């Protein structure tokens, strides 16, 4: 009795790779601005993953875009 290795298996796994720790390393967020932005955002995970509008408030629309795009699709 084995787990069937016969066949192609797709497994969408809910495994958060600790993106939140990398999300605070994004240029434009600002580790110094973190406690100030922490007044708006509960923690770094909501912080950098905040909507463009909220991120634009502290930096700019395009800066927000690079941050928000970063975790959406990185390389």
Curated annotation (Swiss-Prot):
It comes from the Eukaryota. It is found in: Nucleus. The keyword DNA repair applies. GO terms for molecular function: chromatin binding; DNA binding. One of its GO terms (cellular component) is cytosol. The C-terminal region is distantly related to RuvA domain 2, a DNA-binding domain. Signal peptide: none annotated. This is Fanconi anemia core complex-associated protein 24. Coiled coil: none annotated. Its main location: nucleus. GO terms for biological process: interstrand cross-link repair. The keyword Nucleus applies. Keywords: DNA damage, DNA repair, DNA-binding, Nucleus.
